Structures are given as C-alpha cells and as structure tokens.
Amino acid sequence: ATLRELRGRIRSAGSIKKITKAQELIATSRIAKRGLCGAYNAASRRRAMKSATDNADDLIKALTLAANRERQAQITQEISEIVGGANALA
Amino acid sequence: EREEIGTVIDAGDGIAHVEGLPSVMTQELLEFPGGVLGVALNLDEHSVGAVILGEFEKIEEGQQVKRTGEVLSVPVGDAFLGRVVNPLGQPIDGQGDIAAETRRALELQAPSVVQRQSVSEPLQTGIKAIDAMTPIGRGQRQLIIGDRKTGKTAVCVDTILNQREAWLTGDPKQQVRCVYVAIGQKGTTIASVKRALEEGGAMEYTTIVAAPASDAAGFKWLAPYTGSAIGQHWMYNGKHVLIVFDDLSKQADAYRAISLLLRRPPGREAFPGDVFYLHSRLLERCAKLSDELGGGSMTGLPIIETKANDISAFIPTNVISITDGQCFLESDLFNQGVRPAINVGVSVSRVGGAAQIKAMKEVAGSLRLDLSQYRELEAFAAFASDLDAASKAQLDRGARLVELLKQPQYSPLAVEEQVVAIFLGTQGHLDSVPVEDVQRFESELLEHVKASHSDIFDGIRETKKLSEEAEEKLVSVINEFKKGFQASDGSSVVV
Amino acid sequence: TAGRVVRITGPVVDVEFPRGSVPELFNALHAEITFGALAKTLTLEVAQHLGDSLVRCISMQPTDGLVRGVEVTDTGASISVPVGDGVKGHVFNALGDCLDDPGYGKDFEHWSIHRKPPAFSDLEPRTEMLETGLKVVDLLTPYVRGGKIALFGGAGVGKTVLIQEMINRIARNFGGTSVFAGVGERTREGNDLWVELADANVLKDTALVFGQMDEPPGTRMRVALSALTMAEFFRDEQGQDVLLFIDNIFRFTQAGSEVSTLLGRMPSAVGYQPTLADEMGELQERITSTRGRSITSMQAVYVPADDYTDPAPATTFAHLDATTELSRAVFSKGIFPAVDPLASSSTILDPAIVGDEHYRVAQEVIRILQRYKDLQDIIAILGIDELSEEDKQLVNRARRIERFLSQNMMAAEQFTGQPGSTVPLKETIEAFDKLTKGEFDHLPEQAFFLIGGLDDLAKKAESLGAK
Amino acid sequence: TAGRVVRITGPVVDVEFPRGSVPELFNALHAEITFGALAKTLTLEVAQHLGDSLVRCISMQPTDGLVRGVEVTDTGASISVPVGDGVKGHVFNALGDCLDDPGYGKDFEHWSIHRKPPAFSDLEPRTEMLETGLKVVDLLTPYVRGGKIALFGGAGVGKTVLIQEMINRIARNFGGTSVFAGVGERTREGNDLWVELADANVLKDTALVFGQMDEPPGTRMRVALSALTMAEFFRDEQGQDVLLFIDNIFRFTQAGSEVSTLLGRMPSAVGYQPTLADEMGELQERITSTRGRSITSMQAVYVPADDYTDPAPATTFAHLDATTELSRAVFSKGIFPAVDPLASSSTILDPAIVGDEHYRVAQEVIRILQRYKDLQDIIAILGIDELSEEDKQLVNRARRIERFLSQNMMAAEQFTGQPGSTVPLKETIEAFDKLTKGEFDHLPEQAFFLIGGLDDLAKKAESL
Ligand SMILES: Nc1ncnc2c1ncn2[C@@H]1O[C@H](COP(=O)(O)OP(=O)(O)OP(=O)(O)O)[C@@H](O)[C@H]1O
Ligand SMILES: Nc1ncnc2c1ncn2[C@@H]1O[C@H](COP(=O)(O)OP(=O)(O)O)[C@@H](O)[C@H]1O
Ligand SMILES: Nc1ncnc2c1ncn2[C@@H]1O[C@H](COP(=O)(O)OP(=O)(O)O)[C@@H](O)[C@H]1O
Ligand SMILES: [Mg+2]
Ligand SMILES: [Mg+2]
C-alpha cells in the first residue's frame, strides 16, 4: 500500500500546486488593480502563493523519487519471491 | 501407416510429457487418444513437453501419442466472414462447416522491411477523438490501452461498425474485413459483442476468433495468431484487414502460465524471457504491403488492460514500445463524462497526418494546441473575467472542443460528418453556442446538413477536401440553422 | 489393484499404483487413517500423473495420522455429490455428505462435480434489471436477472452483510431454487445463515453447501464445484430459475494457491499459482445462464489487502455482468453499504436498457462524485472557501449525494439497532434527480445519512430542525 | 565433427559435439529447419559450455520446425558482418545478411562483432568538441568528438530530419560516414527510414543495420555490436570519422535482459540482467576517438516510467556526453532544429573545454531564455501588458535569441527549396554575444527565422 499512498499524495500535491500557481497569477493581476497571505496578518498573497507553489513542486519531486524507489523495490521483491520459489522447486 | 509414436510419461494441469517421437518438430501438433490435441513446446533428450489444447482431463500416463508432421496451422478463406471459430479455425457458433480456401501456418514470417510501403490510407474509426487526434492508417498498429471499464472494447467495436459503409461500396480497395479476437473473455461477453456487431450489420465482413476464459491456456495463447493468420490470408490477396486483439494481456498471462508449467525460467512479473517476442512477432504481421505484393494491409488494434493506470508495467511497456501509437483511456475522464475517455494529452499516432484525409488534416490542425492550452488554463475557469481576452477565448473554445469530441457509444460517424463537426468546433461556430448544448447542436446540424444540404458531404467524400465554395455554403447553412436552434437556456445562438 | 501412499507432505499425497491401474485425473481415491483420535477415511483427488505409476493427489480432509504404505482405493470416478429436489432444505459439505442429517441423500442421483461449461452456441446475453430496493445498487450498479453479480471488497467492508441483504430482498420471494455455497468462510457465519434461513422459511427452497476456512485446501477448492453442480442440475434438469450465492469465491483461488508449490508448480506473480486464470475460467464459465435456463449468481469476491490490482480480483472482474465494489475509504467514513460509486459498474447501465432518465441521473451523480473526489485534497489543505462558487455548490451537493447513497439495510439491524428500509427504483431516480439539481441543498447533510426514501428524508430533516 | 541438437526450448538450443570439437563461446553455429513452410538456416550463438560436450546457444531466428538430432555445423568464428565501403547505401540485419539485396556483400571482408575497445594507452586523454555547424548545438550543447549524445523527443518534432542533418554534416564537413543501428526497429519505421534516406540522397552516405522488433532477443542484442563493427572498420581501417546512430539503446539493454532470463540467470535489481553494467560498458567503450579518428554516437534513450534512477537509464547515462531534447513546443513555433535549449545539456560546456568567451555567451543565452520561460505564464494568462518595461525588453530580446537558435538545415532543403548553412563556432559566439547585449532588438523578429550567421541576418533584415 506504500506505493498507492505515495501516488495518492503525488496527485494531491499536483492539484495543490495547480491551485496555488493559479492563485499566485491572480494575485499578480490584483496587485496591478481570506487568509492565504503568508505572514501578512501575523502582494503578500502573491509571494505566499509563489512560496506554496514552489513547496508543492518540491513535495511532488520528493514524492516521485520515493514512488520510484518503491516501484523498483517492489519489482525486485516480486522477482525475489518468484525466483526463490523456482529455486526451491529446482 | 507406420506412424512415429511416443508415450505419455506424465501429465498435469494442461501439460503432458511424452517419451519417443524422436523426429518431432518444435511446435508440432500432436494427437493424443480421444482426439485430443497438443503442441510440442519443450524438446529435450528425455521427452517432449506438450501443451494440451483441450480436454486435458482425458490424458493419462501410458497413452499413445502420434505426431502429425505439421506445425500449427489454420484454415483460411472468405467463408470465415460472419463466423465464430476457435483458435484452430473450428466453428463454435453451431452453424455448420466452414469451407476453407487454403491453410496457413500460424508462424509464417511477417512481411519484410522491403515488402512494405508507407502507411498512407485512413482507417476511419468513426470516433472523432481518434480520427482527429490520433489518426490510424491502414497497416498501422494502434494500441488501445486503459484500465478496465474505460471503453476499450467499445472503441474497437465502433471501429468495426464504422467499416460498414466501406463494405457496402463493394470496392475491395475501400472494403475492410474485420477480425475480432476474444482472448479469455466470458462467453456471454463474446455473445454480447457479436450481438452488437450483428445489429450494426458488421458480421457481413467480420470474423470472430474466440478463446473464452474456460478454454485451455494454449487456446488463449494461440488465438491472436489464428486471427492474424486469417487476416493475413486476406492481406496477401490485396484486401485490407482490421484485426482487434481483445486483449493481449490475457494472452500474455496464458503464455506465462504455459511457460511456468513448462519450468522455463521466469523474469520480471514471472514472465518468460520471450513474452516481448510473443507480442512483437504477433504485431509485426500487421503491415501495409507494397504494390508488388498487392498493396493489401492489416491494421492492428491490440487492447491492453492496465491496473491502476500503471502503463510502466511489463506487458503495457512492451506493447507500447511495439505499436505505432497509443490511445490511452482513463476512468477519471470517463467519470467526468468525457466519453470516449481518451486522454488526448498523452495519446499519440506516429503515422499522424499521413493517415488523415486532407479535409480532416485541415480542420483538425489547431485541435491539439487548442486542447493543450485549454488544459493549461482550466485552473483559471472561475477567474475568466480576470483573464485577458485571448485566454478567456481559449478557455471557452477548449470547453466547446472537449464537448465536441464527446461521442455516444455504437454511433461512429462518417469522415465527412466528422470533418463538418470539427469544422464547427475549430472555426468558432460553437462560440455562440452554450457549452452544455454543443453536443445536441452538433448532432442537429449534422442532421440538417444531411436532410437538405447533402452536397457538402458529397463534395467532402468524393474530393476528400473542403472546397472554398463548399465551405461558404456550409457557413451560410450553419448561420441559418443557428437562427433555427433553441438553446436549452432559451438564449439565441445567433451571431 | 490398489495403490499405496508413498509420500505425505501436508495436504498433498503421492500414491503408487500397479502399472495399468493408475487412476484417471480428478478421480476420487480412499485411504484409511486408523489412529483412534483422528480415525477417518481420507478422500484424495488425483491432481497429477507423476509417471512411473505415481499420482499426486490433494487430500480433502487433514492428513494427520496418515501412514506411508497404507492401501489406497480408486473409486473409478470423480468426487460426486447428490442432486435433485431432495438437496433443498439441507446442509452439505464439499463431498456431498449431509451435515444436518448424516446419511441423507445417499440414495439420490449423484453427479460428478467436474463438468464442462455450456457450449458457446447455447449462451445468450442477459439484459434485464433485477430490482433490489437498495438505492446505490439500483441507481449505479443495477443487477441483472439471470446475470452474474459480484460484491468486491477488502476484509470486513460488508460483503457478507450485503450478501445476506440480497438473500433477504431477492431470495425470500424467489419462485425457484436457491443454492448457497460457503467457500472457505467462517463456520459461525454458516450456522447464522442456516438459522436465519430456517427462521425466514427460505431454507426449504435453499441447498446449503459449506466448506469452511478451517478445512484443508482441497475442500476449499472443491466446495464451489459441489454447490455449482447442484445448481447446474437445477438449471439443466429441473428447468427452474436458480439463485446461486457464493461467499467467498476468492477462497477457491486462494486454496488453489496454497497447494500450488506442493504440486510442483513454479509460482507466478504475487505468489499465485500459474494456472490462476484458467482454473478460475473453468469454474466461472460454469456459473452462467443458458438460453431459457436462468441462473442469477451473486458472488462475494475478497480483495486481498484492499488491493484491487491484485491478480485474483483483477482476473475475476472479467467474469461479471455487474460489480458492486466496496471500499475501505467509504467504510471508514461510516457510509453503509460501503459502495464505491465511482469504481462500481454494471453492463445494463445504459439508456437503452434502463431508460434515458435513469441513465442521465446516474451519470450526473457519478460526475458530481468524481468532481468531489478531485476537490477533496484541495479542501483538505486550502479549505473550502478557496473554491469557486460553483465548486462550493457542487461540494455541498456531493456530500448530500454520497450520504443519501447510504441506506439502513435489513441485514444491518443487528449492528445499528435501526430497522432496514426498501426504496423503489422510481423513487430512487426521482430523489437523486432532485438532489443533483440542488433541491435539497438546504437540508443538513446529517439528514441524508442511513435513511430510505424521500419520506424518511423529510422525517429525519424535521428531527434535525429542517424542512 | 558436427554437433547435433539435443534440447530445444524456444530460442534456447542445447547442442552436443564430439569430445574435442566443442565450439568456443560466442561461436556461430548453423542448423537447418527443413519443414517446407518454415524452412530456414538457423544461426545459433554459443552462450555457455554445459560440460560433457554440451553447449547452450541462443538461436537468432525462431526455432519452430527444428528437430532433435539435426546436424549443427560450427563456423569457427563469432557472428561476423561484412565491412568495407560496400556496406554504405545498403540495409543489413544483425547477422550481416543484406535485406535490400539478399546475398550482397557475402564476398566482402568480414569482421567479428565481438571486439575489444582501444588499448588504454591508445586513447586520447583530452576531450574534443565536434563542431557540427549548427548554432544551437555548437553554442549551448556542444557535442564531444568520440562521445555519446542522448536524443529525446516524441514523434513529429523533427527527429528524423535532425538525424538526416547529422548524416549530411558528417559526410560533407568531416568527410565521414554514418552507420544507423535500429535496435528493436519497427519494420514499418525501418522501411520508412530506408525510403526517406534514399529520397534525401543520404542513403549512399550511411549503412543501415536493422535488428527488428519481431526477432528473437539474440539479434536485438547483437545488432548494436554489428553496426559498431562496421563503424569500427570505417574509423580504424578507412581512417574516417563515423557517426553511429543507435535507436533504441534501451532496447539493447532490454534484449540483454531477455537473453539473460532465457539462459536461466537470476535477475538483478528491477529485473535486469546481472551483467547490465558490463554489457553496456562493452558496447559504449568501443565508441571513442583513437589514433586521430573517432566514432561519435547519437543514441535514442528510453527512460522506463520516466524514472532516471532506473537501472537502464542510470547505466546508459554513465556513458553519455551530451543530451539533446527535441520539444514539440519549439517545433510548433517553426524553430528548426526543435532543440529545447533549456532541457538540452552538454558535459563539455565548461570554460576549461570550450573557452571562457563561449561559456559566458552560452550562460547569458541560458539566463535570458530561462527568464523568458518564467515570464511565459504571466504573458499567457494576464497579457504582456502587465509586464514591466524591463520585462518587455527581456521578452523581445529572448524571442529574438530563441528564433536565432533556429537554422536552415541541410536536410531541410528537400522540404523548403533553400539550402542549409554551416555557421563557424566563432561566428555563432559573437552573434549571440551581440544578441544578448541587445544590438539587434530593433530588427524584426522574422529576420531571425532559419538563417545562418550574421551575413544572412543582415541580408534577411534588409529583405524585410
Ligand atoms: N462512448 C461511450 N459513451 C457512453 N458509454 C460508453 C461509451 N463507451 C463505452 N461506454 C460504456 O462504458 C462501459 C465500459 O465499456 P467497455 O466494456 O467497452 O469497456 P472496457 O474497457 O473494454 O471494459 P472491460 O474491462 O469490461 O473489458 C460499458 O457500459 C459501455 O457501455
Ligand atoms: N450495512 C451495514 N451497516 C452497518 N454496519 C455494517 C454494515 N455492513 C457491514 N457492517 C459492519 O462491518 C462488518 C463487516 O461485514 P461483513 O460483510 O462481515 O464483512 P466482509 O465484507 O468481510 O464480508 C459487519 O460485521 C458490521 O459490523
Ligand atoms: N527543418 C525543417 N524544415 C522543414 N520541415 C521540417 C523540418 N524539420 C521537420 N520538418 C517536417 O516535420 C515533419 C516531422 O519531422 P521528422 O524528423 O520526420 O519527425 P519524426 O522523425 O519524429 O517522424 C517532417 O514531415 C518534416 O517535413
Ligand atoms: Mg473490454
Ligand atoms: Mg464476509
């Protein structure tokens, strides 16, 4: 279930990235003319959503690397089981 | 008649080991008592390992096995049209004998690299998404790949049904003979497919090779080759053939089963080291022959079922590498109402525009980029006012084009109708039409044009081009019909 | 001319026979265990001819106490079970012995449990809806009379409860014969079903065949064939409509995988036997209606580890006309039946068979739920307020729809304490048409949870202060 | 002294020889299938010595119709391919048989396909740049002489035209020749390539070696070595520069995996053959520069699951000197060759190799194009008006630079009547330095489409 969970997380992160990039562009437009504004309460929305888009990109990259490690490892483990059975039947 | 004989030395789950038969050939057909048939796959010093093609429970140690002196072969001829046969060419539809013109060995080599010519003739599927985005030419191998229940069989059946007008022309250069190979399918599923083909009058020109799920693994392994041999007989006689393999995943599973039972070394996913060879040998027989050999062709539509949409699995990877293009179907698109559920962003035809007629090539030129831009902009759907005019127009046009590519099942369209529909989409004639109405609008327009302006369709079909006069007449007809059309929200679609 | 045990390894026994007396494949042989505590008569099924007059067989009972060299007798035939109207109202094991009245059915006609499936020319596709009264089933996974229905799911998502629900709604008023095959499932569940059928007075029309999960692999392999042989007799000889329930068919496959390597077969992917699809094909293709002879079959299919890509359920999917796929995700939300509306399917859900209105409403429900699934991660991170107005409306509608697909079932009262309900198909279609238009958007979503029709909805809403 | 078939298991054939006549490893043996429909001569390749005078071999053709006990003849050598100038303009399979003219080249000199790389002392210790004359390649992703260039890009991006362009340039600029190795070649595409090269009139400059997809894994494994052997003859005996095209190298790796599985070897990680790295090294180390002559290779590389850490691409990229990615986006703009200047890379774009000025100009081009890519989304969604004036200046300059990376290619003369250009490296460096400095922003954009150096730029600017 590890690979399935990782793929679900990759899909979630991709959707979040798309939404945050759209919001960053909308904030760019609104600058020329809610609480997603970074440390504003504690322009700012544009920077916060650019940061969030970059963070989601990094998350997608890391999750994809983990997913590929898991995919390779599953192939290797499956082959190990198959060949172990074959050897024991040799 | 002084026959060479061997003896069954062991038998288990569809495999028999037979001593003797010193002169047996690799892949030779063998006869076991009770009219049981086997295939010699493993030849060694001690015995011959044989795949039993049916009634394995009849086999017993000590039974006499005879060699036939012949590798696997099947009868072939025109009489197989409209019939359902098993991978040995035997009818299973209960409709009597099939008169065979001749016999073909299943493993005859594919046409060579100098016995072909470039794929240049459209194989119209009648499905707008395919005929515009990933066109298929005669001689091409176009993989239909997707998860279960994504509409793969529906697309193949629609293609076969679309060949009916071509059949009725009576001209062998336009006619397409269809072979449907069912591998591992439930018998009533095959019956449903045949019923669908009969309703659309496709069994006139269609043969079904059936290897249902209850058949021996040998039959499932052999069925694609049998369908290929039947089709090849026509291909080498100047005919054009469309063969559907539904589906090659089941055939690979059957071959893996046989190989493991034969103790052949397993690799990734436990497949033998020649599964790629299995499918590539099958699919390279689909070809477009040169004029020296009669110019016939066979178009392959292998179907692959992915699990959780993992196209990097072993067998999908192999078949994707083998084929000339891929139609990826997706269940998420299917649930979104995008039917047929083809992912135009990842689907490809390497033959491309060479497989389209000029009119389709023209009207469909901008489709790919329009759809890509729409997919990029979809995030900004709710901010369309904030979008600049160009991006807003791109968003609206993409929505309308996505509606345009939708198609009901069992209803393929003629190439002229497809051209007119895509012309509506890509010439901005759907811009004034509400998205939710596009489909209906299109259908009605196509009805209208067929009722009173057939000359447009006639010009497109005869010339394969949309002339300037035809285009202007079509535009005026569109605007008049727009005056006539009632949007579901009541707003006029005029201007 | 008798054999003798040569090797014993768990449930697989090698038997040597005199040359010229090797039993045919699938023949039943008898061997004695004489140890007092475990004394019994083993039935062995011939699996392979190993050569040199040796056969590899699968024991039907545990081999504990079996001794090398003891006599093995060939019955000359396959395992055969009693058939006829007499099997109705009685409980049998995979070997045909009657459990509730031992010795009963000894004198009946007996049929071998190994049989070829119907000929292809005798097969007729079935397109006729079998209305259940369950909203989600009737709307999104309509069942087919005389067709093949499966309930897929991981462990403990409600396959058995839904099987009992379908016995309640379909078998109770059935005008034909019912066959229930317990394949490798809990003995307690079998006793519960037996008692419940006796209470409902459905037992008199039902033949029960049990091979429980505690039996050796051979029994779990053959019990389905035994039940199916009884059903086939009712289909082809008596010529009446038959209901066939199997819980759980996956056990068949699992049992086959448990003896595969002991039978000397190199394992396939994911540890399954190489013959997975072929054995499943034999069995499943026997489970079918033929022209004029109806078997409505309903199979519970266990999905190992909830992994729907697992080869067993993946291979099973091709054999069904309708599939209700149960989801752990839906279960954990408290939605019962835990049906995944997006993944489930039915071959008769198209306008031609079910009509334009039903098809349209079902497609709209699926589209809304798919969009909600797409939006769930965004709602989890950024919150709902960052959606567009239309997406917020769709999310509210989707939450109400997903809750309204849940239903208080008759078989679930033992768990909720709430009595069940039945919803007519027309009412279901109208209710979901209203829901997809937002006609109930003003009611609290908790008003839609585990109810029947629109009257139940109104009552619960008033109980919640809405209307 | 001839052997006999003892076991047949698909493409694996066990053969028994008399005690003292056992063939050496990798020897080519010949057997006959006499059944009329499938009649053929099988080539087996000795893979293992099983002991007791048995050898295990991989059949190069399907074994259907083979009979136990048939005679097996030892040729006394490994698979050997014809070599010489005669192989140019002709199509061969992995065994040296001519496909376009059966029997052709049987009298040529024949070289064994199993050869060692140049001796360690015979190698050139310093990298060199293969000046192609194409602006984009020369400036941003210079190719290494004797190195390996990965090529990427789906159908329809101008990949075949780029291959034809490189064939042209190696033939006309370096006086060299080309060898195309279709590893796991689709027969339709092999035929298409043959006809297209004949139409382009570059077939005479190139030898085609096809190991087709529908062949057993052995030929798909050995076809790359066969093409490499022809290229090695051209480099070492005819003293020519050779360009060796391999499509697809991943299919060579996968055919190796299939063979390894067929021979009963236990798979390594992710199912590949245990000797994956050794096989790839044996292939790739033969592609080098030695004694003043070089084989340069452009190799199509498939990446499973887009996973660059997958063992096959990971092993292949240990040997790759440059990467050229062809982008549908660039192609759609009419910029040919459609090389994606940002995704493409070269390991010799360093000051120490190409010089300081080249490095500086290339980095400036990359920076401008990257900033343009960043501004692209704003341009598309909010419009170019929203951008600051400096952003507009950068957009104009970057658009001119990216159009100037286009060129009129030799192979493009057959579609557009105009001939191609060869821009010297110094000219490209100075032209792009001026372009980055902003000395042509006034000139119209179309002036930069499909031209050579600065003379062409001035000519087209005045013609507009
Ligand atoms: N264009 C379409 N429009 C609407 N429904 C469609 C369309 N194409 C297919 N369907 C429906 O989708 C469902 C799946 O179709 P189909 O059986 O062809 O898919 P599949 O991928 O081949 O499935 P399987 O896994 O059963 O082989 C069926 O109900 C079919 O009627
Ligand atoms: N419709 C339902 N309503 C309430 N609880 C249910 C319902 N269905 C199942 N459950 C709970 O989940 C458990 C699993 O049901 P069961 O059908 O036995 O699982 P499986 O899917 O493994 O057969 C039940 O024992 C019950 O406690
Ligand atoms: N530099 C160019 N000038 C003119 N036309 C080109 C150029 N590059 C590519 N094309 C056209 O684009 C098409 C695709 O190019 P090609 O290299 O054949 O793609 P692929 O190799 O992927 O099939 C060709 O038909 C060709 O006519
Ligand atoms: Mg299908
Ligand atoms: Mg249960």
mmCIF file of N, CA, C and O in Angstrom, chain B residues 350-382:
data_model
loop_
_atom_site.group_PDB
_atom_site.id
_atom_site.type_symbol
_atom_site.label_atom_id
_atom_site.label_comp_id
_atom_site.label_asym_id
_atom_site.label_seq_id
_atom_site.Cartn_x
_atom_site.Cartn_y
_atom_site.Cartn_z
ATOM 1 N N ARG B 350 1.995 7.923 -34.378
ATOM 2 C CA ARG B 350 3.239 8.266 -35.052
ATOM 3 C C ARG B 350 3.066 8.364 -36.560
ATOM 4 O O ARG B 350 3.844 9.058 -37.216
ATOM 5 N N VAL B 351 2.071 7.679 -37.123
ATOM 6 C CA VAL B 351 1.736 7.883 -38.527
ATOM 7 C C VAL B 351 1.148 9.274 -38.728
ATOM 8 O O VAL B 351 1.460 9.962 -39.705
ATOM 9 N N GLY B 352 0.286 9.705 -37.812
ATOM 10 C CA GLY B 352 -0.173 11.080 -37.801
ATOM 11 C C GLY B 352 -0.944 11.460 -39.048
ATOM 12 O O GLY B 352 -1.786 10.710 -39.549
ATOM 13 N N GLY B 353 -0.643 12.654 -39.561
ATOM 14 C CA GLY B 353 -1.426 13.242 -40.633
ATOM 15 C C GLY B 353 -1.408 12.453 -41.923
ATOM 16 O O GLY B 353 -2.308 12.620 -42.748
ATOM 17 N N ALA B 354 -0.403 11.601 -42.122
ATOM 18 C CA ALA B 354 -0.396 10.729 -43.288
ATOM 19 C C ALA B 354 -1.612 9.812 -43.322
ATOM 20 O O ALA B 354 -1.987 9.338 -44.397
ATOM 21 N N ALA B 355 -2.233 9.555 -42.176
ATOM 22 C CA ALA B 355 -3.393 8.682 -42.097
ATOM 23 C C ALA B 355 -4.715 9.433 -42.173
ATOM 24 O O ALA B 355 -5.770 8.805 -42.055
ATOM 25 N N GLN B 356 -4.691 10.746 -42.367
ATOM 26 C CA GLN B 356 -5.897 11.554 -42.456
ATOM 27 C C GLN B 356 -6.125 11.992 -43.895
ATOM 28 O O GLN B 356 -5.184 12.097 -44.684
ATOM 29 N N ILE B 357 -7.389 12.230 -44.239
ATOM 30 C CA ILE B 357 -7.697 12.898 -45.497
ATOM 31 C C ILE B 357 -7.416 14.389 -45.353
ATOM 32 O O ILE B 357 -7.324 14.925 -44.249
ATOM 33 N N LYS B 358 -7.278 15.069 -46.490
ATOM 34 C CA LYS B 358 -6.833 16.458 -46.456
ATOM 35 C C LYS B 358 -7.806 17.338 -45.680
ATOM 36 O O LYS B 358 -7.384 18.221 -44.926
ATOM 37 N N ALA B 359 -9.107 17.123 -45.855
ATOM 38 C CA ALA B 359 -10.087 17.950 -45.158
ATOM 39 C C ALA B 359 -9.944 17.814 -43.646
ATOM 40 O O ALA B 359 -9.921 18.815 -42.919
ATOM 41 N N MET B 360 -9.847 16.577 -43.154
ATOM 42 C CA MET B 360 -9.637 16.359 -41.727
ATOM 43 C C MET B 360 -8.308 16.947 -41.280
ATOM 44 O O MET B 360 -8.216 17.556 -40.208
ATOM 45 N N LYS B 361 -7.267 16.772 -42.089
ATOM 46 C CA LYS B 361 -5.970 17.351 -41.766
ATOM 47 C C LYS B 361 -6.077 18.853 -41.559
ATOM 48 O O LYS B 361 -5.433 19.413 -40.665
ATOM 49 N N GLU B 362 -6.889 19.523 -42.376
ATOM 50 C CA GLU B 362 -7.033 20.970 -42.257
ATOM 51 C C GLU B 362 -7.862 21.343 -41.033
ATOM 52 O O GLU B 362 -7.395 22.077 -40.156
ATOM 53 N N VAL B 363 -9.096 20.841 -40.948
ATOM 54 C CA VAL B 363 -9.978 21.268 -39.863
ATOM 55 C C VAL B 363 -9.420 20.861 -38.506
ATOM 56 O O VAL B 363 -9.705 21.510 -37.493
ATOM 57 N N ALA B 364 -8.630 19.793 -38.451
ATOM 58 C CA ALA B 364 -8.106 19.276 -37.195
ATOM 59 C C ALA B 364 -6.712 19.796 -36.876
ATOM 60 O O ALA B 364 -6.076 19.294 -35.946
ATOM 61 N N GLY B 365 -6.219 20.777 -37.629
ATOM 62 C CA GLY B 365 -4.855 21.235 -37.422
ATOM 63 C C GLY B 365 -4.647 21.862 -36.059
ATOM 64 O O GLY B 365 -3.681 21.552 -35.361
ATOM 65 N N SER B 366 -5.557 22.744 -35.658
ATOM 66 C CA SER B 366 -5.409 23.503 -34.425
ATOM 67 C C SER B 366 -5.918 22.765 -33.194
ATOM 68 O O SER B 366 -5.755 23.269 -32.078
ATOM 69 N N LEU B 367 -6.520 21.587 -33.364
ATOM 70 C CA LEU B 367 -7.163 20.914 -32.243
ATOM 71 C C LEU B 367 -6.174 20.633 -31.120
ATOM 72 O O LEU B 367 -6.462 20.892 -29.946
ATOM 73 N N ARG B 368 -5.004 20.090 -31.456
ATOM 74 C CA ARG B 368 -4.070 19.662 -30.421
ATOM 75 C C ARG B 368 -3.650 20.834 -29.545
ATOM 76 O O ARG B 368 -3.718 20.762 -28.312
ATOM 77 N N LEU B 369 -3.215 21.929 -30.170
ATOM 78 C CA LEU B 369 -2.758 23.083 -29.408
ATOM 79 C C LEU B 369 -3.904 23.732 -28.647
ATOM 80 O O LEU B 369 -3.724 24.177 -27.509
ATOM 81 N N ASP B 370 -5.087 23.806 -29.258
ATOM 82 C CA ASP B 370 -6.235 24.363 -28.554
ATOM 83 C C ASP B 370 -6.523 23.575 -27.285
ATOM 84 O O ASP B 370 -6.737 24.160 -26.217
ATOM 85 N N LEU B 371 -6.501 22.245 -27.374
ATOM 86 C CA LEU B 371 -6.790 21.425 -26.205
ATOM 87 C C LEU B 371 -5.692 21.543 -25.157
ATOM 88 O O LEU B 371 -5.976 21.572 -23.953
ATOM 89 N N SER B 372 -4.431 21.607 -25.585
ATOM 90 C CA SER B 372 -3.353 21.769 -24.615
ATOM 91 C C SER B 372 -3.480 23.093 -23.875
ATOM 92 O O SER B 372 -3.355 23.145 -22.644
ATOM 93 N N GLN B 373 -3.744 24.176 -24.606
ATOM 94 C CA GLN B 373 -3.918 25.473 -23.965
ATOM 95 C C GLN B 373 -5.113 25.459 -23.025
ATOM 96 O O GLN B 373 -5.071 26.055 -21.942
ATOM 97 N N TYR B 374 -6.190 24.781 -23.418
ATOM 98 C CA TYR B 374 -7.340 24.663 -22.534
ATOM 99 C C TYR B 374 -6.972 23.948 -21.244
ATOM 100 O O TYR B 374 -7.408 24.340 -20.157
ATOM 101 N N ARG B 375 -6.190 22.873 -21.347
ATOM 102 C CA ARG B 375 -5.809 22.143 -20.145
ATOM 103 C C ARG B 375 -4.939 23.008 -19.247
ATOM 104 O O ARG B 375 -5.075 22.973 -18.019
ATOM 105 N N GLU B 376 -4.039 23.793 -19.840
ATOM 106 C CA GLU B 376 -3.231 24.709 -19.038
ATOM 107 C C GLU B 376 -4.098 25.748 -18.338
ATOM 108 O O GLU B 376 -3.859 26.080 -17.172
ATOM 109 N N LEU B 377 -5.108 26.271 -19.025
ATOM 110 C CA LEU B 377 -5.912 27.356 -18.480
ATOM 111 C C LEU B 377 -7.047 26.894 -17.575
ATOM 112 O O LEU B 377 -7.655 27.735 -16.908
ATOM 113 N N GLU B 378 -7.352 25.597 -17.537
ATOM 114 C CA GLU B 378 -8.532 25.146 -16.800
ATOM 115 C C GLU B 378 -8.513 25.597 -15.344
ATOM 116 O O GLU B 378 -9.575 25.797 -14.745
ATOM 117 N N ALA B 379 -7.328 25.762 -14.755
ATOM 118 C CA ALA B 379 -7.256 26.235 -13.377
ATOM 119 C C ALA B 379 -7.921 27.595 -13.214
ATOM 120 O O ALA B 379 -8.444 27.903 -12.139
ATOM 121 N N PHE B 380 -7.920 28.416 -14.265
ATOM 122 C CA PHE B 380 -8.455 29.769 -14.218
ATOM 123 C C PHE B 380 -9.896 29.842 -14.708
ATOM 124 O O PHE B 380 -10.329 30.885 -15.208
ATOM 125 N N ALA B 381 -10.654 28.753 -14.578
ATOM 126 C CA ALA B 381 -12.023 28.744 -15.087
ATOM 127 C C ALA B 381 -12.873 29.807 -14.405
ATOM 128 O O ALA B 381 -13.577 30.577 -15.069
ATOM 129 N N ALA B 382 -12.811 29.869 -13.077
ATOM 130 C CA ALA B 382 -13.663 30.764 -12.305
ATOM 131 C C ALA B 382 -13.177 32.205 -12.309
ATOM 132 O O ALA B 382 -13.895 33.084 -11.823
#
